[PDB]
Symmetry: D2
Subunit: 303 residues, 4 copies
């Protein structure tokens, strides 16, 4: 393996071209993004056989400083005329390979830095502010792109993936986990009604990578829509395990978005331990945080 | 100093009695909490002269185990018939002092563990779920209470404070910071239009401690309302510094809630560094994360 | 309350004047500090009635920018000719109040950023390197200093404290916790031999503030020596609780350092849960991490 | 993809069989591990085609509960008679596949939870304690192992790697970074003498998997030895870039351990920004923390 790059390249742009014309689905109010504030955290990795002597001999002649890669990314967010993180990564990748002929491969990760709407009152009326936003530490969109230079000097996208990360959902009832193996190592009681608490990271791939860019917005799949499908399916489903749930979320996503080829899940189980099972004259219960070990599941659904 | 206790006592309750009937204000449509899910992180500290030998002699005779304090809190969340964190702390404090005659003082901190509503579809109609919630790592309510046993065996609240922590707000324009001292130590340029990014922790005290419990909801001041005041005032104000902003937020809070005696602010400056000042054919700019040092301000406004 | 300032002011200095001429104690081999590399994280807070209009009117005329405070601290670490973080704080404080006559009070916290010795082979032998250091995320020394300008324009130190933070110590056997209250809230079993795991934060106060600066280093009390007293007393003691342990550590500190007035402890219990009590043919056991709630104790020992 | 498992399975064991009989190298005084206290954090992932219906149908018949996997790992740490984390992983893997014939693949990651020696005074002298240990949050050893069940129910190891994570080393002088590309994206000045601060994660792979287990300990490669090579080479080298440094470290590792097939580096650059370059009557300087973006390098050295 031989590559190098820059991580945690934060870049915030005001007034990016708005994303409009996105096809709505019944699960979600999402129709677009105003892009008054657009934040991204970029990681760039580059490779090429001509980088070898930078390692083996300390020769810096063909080293683009990682600091310069940071400058490259920040300047390109200023000149970017598109509407999505996916398209931004393509712009950066293409631009970087066009600039630096000795680089044969570039891999980019972009993570949205999400902001939420806030409200303000003017002359007695409360409305969404176009100026003040709330920084969210909750779920966020992601994008990944790898691009290579071929021997005939064409540039080709070899991998593209979009995602939603950091989604933490708890369903207070309507979840079971029963029927699993009971042997000498099993102490977990069967539970016909648990408050299943899952962390979800959901990633999707498009049949046609161009659809990821947002250039034809009707084919774009927004992370916000994926969020709302996940919460709707969780609500609707009498879950039988996390495994069972994520398969059903995946199926619904692929149904709603025939332009997608696959959906990949990484889930974790953070369900609370029960402390008080019955409260007089109430349906309520009390739970607390578990010990650190957490279950996880990984599964791909294909179109 | 001589006390001991338990921290990070997480307790989650389903179907707490709903908070209803809260008086609305122009800045906020908040009227109550459904309390399908109610999460709190409690810290309990206790003292009393009779604890001395637990330290000086290793005599555990009058040691309530910290593990038992944890059990005490969790059990009391199950039996609590009220509607606020403030009220819950009063219930635990009074109960604990009534139980353990050798304890002369109890301090409690409670921090809300916040959950947000999510969408689900039934019959093509998207509505808020009553089952599925999103764990939020953004702002959260807080409460503080200290209670002492007097020499005549009466129990007295000696301090009470409510709060909102973890609010992170950025206003993209309509902020300045000019006119500060310029001497041998000053390198900061004056900025007539900065994208001010502040972290806010806001705490209030009531004139009458009883109003904090929520038993008469008309007199209760909800953290959600304070949040909405802060965003509205930030939007409305051409800020001249964070100092200037927090004073104005404070004044608006005390105007809206005459039952409050004071509001206390701890703010931090996290404003991004500008990288690209002018983008062709756009109002946009590009910013990035600053170096670690952060400014802060601390200020009390009184009624 | 009314103050403002700067936090996370990191500053790294090479070749600070070494600390030597210290007075030894039986528990510790500590003999001074080389100071090839000296790192500090400083927080500065300033106050004064003349700052009021910076809040109430947005008048920045008498505002020292927090960015300028950062510059002040960093420049002063360059010119500091002493040997201790405590002395550095006094130097900054005095210098700041002298520069800014409208400031009435300054509070400083300094936290050591610790580095550890590494070894290298050269010229035929393995020896301590004078160039390569390992950054440590373990325990670190602390210092606190407040200074005021009096009505007559003279300066006084109004509080000084030194400390050790982040010490995490586990004793595998020779600890008990028995004899505590067993009532309707108790589920903790008595344990005659537990692997007590404590987090310790230890703060001390000198009778004479001058002894904290290092100017007469024989009177200085080093965090390294305090660490060594803590580990020694923990080993020596059949502990009966954390309360019992910290009292004994405090007594030892005050016996070894008669120039101290008092020592304050903040301890936390992070003792592991037992999984396997008996292992065939071995004295070993197996333990795991507990649920999040942690016990804590706060205790002052005075001469 | 289809797999599931448990993360953050902490297990602490006292009195594991000591590691001794290791083969020394010039860079390291390492001579073994006492194993009075041995801590590991294990992640387990399992897969196999027979798990499909747990996802597609909610059928838990062939599901080993992740909680059971946690129990399995903890109980196996009690019965493990070996001397290395690598050997522990092999023991767990073999045992698990033997127990659960419907599982086709198991992956394990083990991370050391490191403890450091402390000293105590007893019987007249200060000596290393056999009872009290300091938990370290610095560098730690790692191990990876994957195992498969083939058609004939035979088991094979399919991947094995050992490593050292979390090493943070700063060298105050004797580092340059000059001669890199200076173009329209470059603002980094050349630096003939910088205080290079690198984070290092180093992974190695043995020619013969058996050498990783400790069974013939003279063939074992200890993380402690690798650490000591890294510090020595960093000290010895007038570095020309991080790329240049890690190549040299890798060459030294492979020269010292001919039983290794390759060594892989992940490095990051966290070098401080300079604030004061010249101090009167001193060789010292002052530096501070940089903005968040960090350079990184990824490189494999092979025999
Ligand atoms: O949904 C679940 N899947 C699992 O594999 C599991 N194991 N324990 N609890 C569990 N819950
Ligand atoms: O709002 C601000 N207040 C301040 O005190 C300050 N100092 N630097 N920048 C600043 N901004
Ligand atoms: O040392 C201890 N002190 C305590 O107060 C306590 N409570 N539970 N366990 C405990 N251990
Ligand atoms: O050692 C370095 N390698 C790099 O690639 C680099 N880029 N900026 N600074 C750097 N330092
Ligand atoms: Cl699970
Ligand atoms: Cl500030
Ligand atoms: Cl405790
Ligand atoms: Cl770099
Ligand atoms: K000594
Ligand atoms: K040696």
């Amino acid at each position: 393996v031989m590559y190098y790059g820059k991580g945690d390249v934060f870049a915030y742009r005001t007034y990016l071209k708005p994303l409009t014309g996105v096809r709505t689905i019944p699960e979600s109010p999402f129709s677009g993004r105003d892009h008054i504030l657009f934040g991204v955290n970029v990681k760039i990795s580059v490779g090429g056989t001509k980088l070898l002597t930078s390692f083996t001999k300390g020769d810096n002649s063909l080293v683009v400083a990682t600091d310069s890669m940071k400058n490259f990314i920040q300047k390109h967010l200023a000149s970017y005329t598109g509407t999505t993180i996916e398209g931004f990564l393509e712009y950066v990748a293409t631009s970087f390979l066009k600039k630096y002929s000795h680089i044969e491969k570039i891999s980019l990760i972009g993570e949205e830095i999400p902001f939420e709407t806030t409200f303000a009152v003017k002359n007695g009326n409360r409305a969404a502010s176009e100026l003040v936003f709330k920084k969210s530490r909750n779920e966020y969109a992601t994008a990944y792109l790898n691009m290579v230079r071929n021997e005939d000097n064409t540039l080709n996208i070899t991998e593209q993936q979009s995602g939603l990360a950091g989604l933490q959902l708890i369903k207070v009832s309507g979840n079971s986990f029963v029927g699993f193996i009971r042997d000498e190592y099993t102490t977990l009681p069967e539970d016909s009604n648990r408050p299943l608490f899952v962390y979800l990271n959901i990633k999707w791939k498009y049949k046609n990578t161009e659809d990821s860019f947002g250039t034809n917005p009707e084919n774009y799949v927004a992370a916000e829509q994926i969020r709302d499908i996940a919460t709707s399916v969780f609500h609707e489903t009498e879950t039988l395990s996390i495994q069972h749930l994520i398969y059903l979320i995946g199926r619904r996503i692929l149904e709603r978005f025939p332009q997608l080829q696959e959906v990949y899940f990484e889930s974790q189980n953070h369900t609370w331990d029960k402390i008080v099972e019955e409260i007089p004259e109430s349906e309520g219960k009390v739970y607390t945080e578990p010990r650190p070990p957490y279950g996880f599941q990984c599964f791909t659904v294909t179109q």
